[PDB]
Design a protein around this ligand. Structure first.
Ligand SMILES: *[C@@H]1O[C@H](CO)[C@@H](O[C@@H]2O[C@H](CO)[C@@H](O)[C@H](O)[C@H]2NC(C)=O)[C@H](O)[C@H]1NC(C)=O
Ligand SMILES: *[C@@H]1O[C@H](CO)[C@@H](O[C@@H]2O[C@H](CO)[C@@H](O)[C@H](O)[C@H]2NC(C)=O)[C@H](O)[C@H]1NC(C)=O
Ligand SMILES: *[C@@H]1O[C@H](CO)[C@@H](O[C@@H]2O[C@H](CO)[C@@H](O)[C@H](O)[C@H]2NC(C)=O)[C@H](O)[C@H]1NC(C)=O
Ligand SMILES: *[C@@H]1O[C@H](CO)[C@@H](O[C@@H]2O[C@H](CO)[C@@H](O)[C@H](O)[C@H]2NC(C)=O)[C@H](O)[C@H]1NC(C)=O
Ligand SMILES: *[C@@H]1O[C@H](CO)[C@@H](O[C@@H]2O[C@H](CO)[C@@H](O)[C@H](O)[C@H]2NC(C)=O)[C@H](O)[C@H]1NC(C)=O
Ligand SMILES: *[C@@H]1O[C@H](CO)[C@@H](O)[C@H](O)[C@H]1NC(C)=O
Ligand SMILES: *[C@@H]1O[C@H](CO)[C@@H](O)[C@H](O)[C@H]1NC(C)=O
Ligand SMILES: *[C@@H]1O[C@H](CO)[C@@H](O)[C@H](O)[C@H]1NC(C)=O
Ligand SMILES: *[C@@H]1O[C@H](CO)[C@@H](O)[C@H](O)[C@H]1NC(C)=O
Lengths: 238, 244, 94, 49, 49
């Protein structure tokens, strides 16, 4: 410090150094340790053991199996040298799992299987067979349409509350129009996706297409809802 | 015939379909038979749709819970404040409750607006996928499933859509020796739509996605220049059909 | 910082670099085959000829100008470091 | 405490954002399944990488 | 109250910025899929030319 200066301030305007009034000495001030506490579990179905992670603290303050990672202090897990596919993410490339009796272990994430391609300036690879693959993709379309009555929610049934509220200006009008716009948007979203065809086409009564079986995705007349089996499964699941 | 069109669309000749029709139909039936088991076995697969519902429900509960809150006032119940207290001191309590209950509504509306924007983006993507994967065959990589896209099927679900993508995957590959061009009579020859491969003793020309060797012929290749500029040219013979 | 904390990302920089290296090796050795199934090896000039065919130019055009094309590519990739380092505002988006 | 529940909503929003960031990073780079390696001999017909 | 309002505003801004970053990441993933793992016919999607 300069001889007349008494304490030191930071960029954020927080005191970080001080001068002792008796001995002309400078001291650094450091905040006391704090952090978050998280629990890692394999599910009460699988076991009742847990591990505990203290985030962003040195392992010397938490006073078993103790480990120090860039995420913080880990207690109750055994560190190994293997590498598996990640199961429970911890942070900075560290993952945890429940492995062999049985115990909680920690390890490094494994990116994948190592492979090398025999490259040469003279050789090629040509396939001799093929496979037909079917895959599923799921996409949400719309959400629930809600409406709110502002006066009944705020003032219930009393009257002078409404008299006080109307002094606050036009604040109830802008909420209704936003909610109505959202509802109209949902209705437009459904139409944009599903109403793409002009006419309703029908399958021939004789369902033969050269040996291809489409019964799993075609409508089932027996069911009153007239849905396909896959559609019924999806409907019942949610 | 439509399926043959679709094989042509990805660079495979028509005869490959017509000579393997039964096997391909069996493979398609077996693949479509496992969709129900794959969906039912893992409940988390549909969780995304479920997720949306949960979010909405949660919001409503929060909007109720702010009602039973004092918000720094004497009590949450308003009628008791009316009954017990005098008009001077009642007004400040009423105003406090009014402001506290108005902020809660404002926050809810803002969250709803943000979620609506996200849902709109998802719906736009779904409409694009319906336009390009179901009403046509797409050349974009990984847009309609994984592999060489053949076709797709839509199915409906509560607040959502499910696409089944049918694609083609190569398998059982072998290794061969190649050459960029073939020199026959001081002239360079190049394949018209295939590639030159060698069995170790003989040379053939084949399509690039399915092994089907054929004899090099003047109607399989075209001539361009001498045998000096090309690096890696290989001596061989080219058969001429006109042999009367 | 008073109750404010920053959490580290799950994937480190080295893992991302390894992913990019794997992608580069795959595209250099197998062309576009590894993106749709098993990786199939092919010489690089033949892959370049396939790519010229993809845009409406015949194979002989590339096979008769291989050295010139390689030299042009080398010069173009060489200029990239200078062009990127010269302008500080190039990376302003990040 | 007398005010009510705000901390829970703030915490849940921040955690959602934090998880979304890792999802975004994983969506771009983790497309390949195997770790491919380049051959020890770096010759590709004159092209320099 | 004055300190709670600032947290609310900060969380709202973070949500908006996170949405923008998510859109950018989606675009980057699409470009990785279509320009690196294949050859694109779309004009001006993977460079000029
Ligand atoms: C304030 O008073 C204390 C004593 O009450 C001083 O401490 C001593 O100061 C003398 C100065 O000649 C030193 O020789 C001693 O060594 C100090 N004591 C110890 C234990 O070290 C202190 O210096 C005074 N402060 C100022 C600024 O003069
Ligand atoms: C390409 O793969 C198919 C698998 O779908 C092979 O077909 C199988 O062949 C074996 C023996 O030839 C039979 O036991 C199986 O029943 C066949 N599977 C089906 C679904 O029919 C086919 O043989 C392979 N191609 C070649 C040239 O071997
Ligand atoms: C198309 O596939 C469906 C479903 O696999 C077939 O329906 C099955 O038919 C057999 C007849 O031997 C019954 O034992 C099964 O119970 C049926 N399954 C279901 C889910 O109903 C149908 O036969 C196939 N179509 C053709 C022409 O083979
Ligand atoms: C590579 O393939 C060629 C073409 O099939 C083989 O040449 C034929 O081999 C069969 C039996 O080996 C003979 O009956 C034919 O007469 C051969 N063709 C001609 C034009 O003579 C060749 O043997 C194969 N080489 C290897 C190493 O498999
Ligand atoms: C591939 O390119 C690198 C860099 O462009 C070449 O390395 C440089 O080569 C020049 C000569 O052309 C030298 O003056 C530099 O000192 C080299 N730099 C380094 C870091 O090595 C490399 O030689 C090229 N490969 C081949 C086979 O030519
Ligand atoms: C992992 O192996 C290294 C190699 O030296 C060793 O130092 C370390 O103690 C090992 N740790 C575990 C948990 O096996
Ligand atoms: C392939 O490259 C090697 C050098 O790594 C060279 O010796 C060989 O001749 C090349 N092959 C051909 C067909 O040019
Ligand atoms: C083909 O032979 C080469 C040897 O040049 C070898 O490296 C490669 O693995 C072989 N491919 C198969 C599918 O066996
Ligand atoms: C191809 O044949 C010509 C003429 O018969 C000869 O000059 C040339 O060396 C041959 N090429 C090779 C690689 O032997």
């Amino acid at each position: 410090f300069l001889p007349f200066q008494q304490f030191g301030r930071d960029i954020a305007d927080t005191t970080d150094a001080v001068r002792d009034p008796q001995t002309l000495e400078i001291l650094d001030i450091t905040p006391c340790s704090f952090g978050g506490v998280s629990v890692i579990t394999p599910g009460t179905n699988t076991s009742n053991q847990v591990a505990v992670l203290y985030q962003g603290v040195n392992c010397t303050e938490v006073p078993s199996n103790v480990f120090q990672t860039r995420a913080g202090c880990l207690i109750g897990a055994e560190y190994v040298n293997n590498s598996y596919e990640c199961d429970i993410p911890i942070g900075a490339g560290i993952c945890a799992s429940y492995q062999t009796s049985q115990s909680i272990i920690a390890y490094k994430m494994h990116l994948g299987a190592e492979n090398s391609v025999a490259y040469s300036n003279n050789s090629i690879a040509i396939p001799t067979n093929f496979t037909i693959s079917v895959t599923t993709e799921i996409l949400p379309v719309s959400m629930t349409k809600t409406s709110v009555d502002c006066t009944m929610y705020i003032c219930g049934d009393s009257t002078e509350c409404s008299n006080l509220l109307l002094q606050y200006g036009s604040f109830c009008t802008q909420l209704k129009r936003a909610l109505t716009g959202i509802a109209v948007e949902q209705d437009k979203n459904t139409q944009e996706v599903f109403a793409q065809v002009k006419q309703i086409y029908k399958t021939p009564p004789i369902k033969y297409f050269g040996g291809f079986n489409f019964s799993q995705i075609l409508p089932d007349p027996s069911k009153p809802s007239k849905r396909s089996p896959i559609e019924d499964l999806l409907f019942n699941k949610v | 015939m439509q399926m043959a069109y679709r094989f042509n669309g990805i660079g495979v000749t028509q005869n490959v379909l017509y000579e393997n029709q039964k096997l391909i139909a069996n493979q398609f039936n077996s693949a479509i038979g496992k969709i129900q088991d794959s969906l039912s076995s893992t409940p988390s697969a549909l969780g995304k749709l479920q997720n949306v519902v949960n979010h909405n429900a949660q919001a409503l509960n929060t909007l109720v819970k702010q009602l039973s809150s004092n918000f720094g006032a004497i009590s949450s119940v308003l009628n008791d404040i009316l009954s017990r207290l005098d008009p001077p001191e009642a007004e400040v309590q009423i105003d406090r409750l009014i402001t506290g209950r108005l902020q809660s509504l404002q926050t809810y509306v803002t969250q709803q607006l943000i979620r609506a924007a996200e849902i709109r983006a998802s719906a736009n993507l779904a409409a694009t996928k319906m336009s390009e994967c179901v009403l046509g065959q797409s050349k974009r990589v990984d847009f309609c499933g994984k592999g060489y896209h053949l076709m797709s099927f839509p199915q409906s679900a509560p607040h959502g859509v499910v696409f089944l993508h049918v694609t083609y995957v190569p398998a059982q590959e072998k290794n061969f020796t190649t050459a960029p061009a073939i020199c026959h009579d001081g002239k360079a020859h190049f394949p018209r739509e295939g590639v030159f491969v060698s069995n170790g003793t003989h040379w053939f020309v084949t399509q690039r996605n399915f092994y089907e060797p054929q004899i090099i012929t003047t109607d399989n290749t075209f001539v361009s220049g001498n045998c000096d500029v090309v690096i890696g040219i290989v001596n061989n013979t080219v058969y001429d059909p006109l042999q009367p | 910082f008073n109750g404010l904390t920053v959490l580290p990302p799950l994937l480190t920089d080295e893992m991302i670099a390894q992913y990019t290296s794997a992608l580069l090796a795959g595209t250099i050795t197998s062309g576009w085959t590894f993106g749709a199934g098993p990786a199939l090896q092919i010489p690089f000039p033949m892959q370049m000829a396939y790519r010229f065919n993809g845009i409406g130019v015949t194979q002989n055009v590339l096979y008769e100008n291989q050295k010139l094309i390689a030299n042009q590519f080398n010069s173009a990739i060489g200029k990239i470091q200078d062009s990127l380092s010269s302008t500080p505002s190039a990376l302003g988006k990040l």
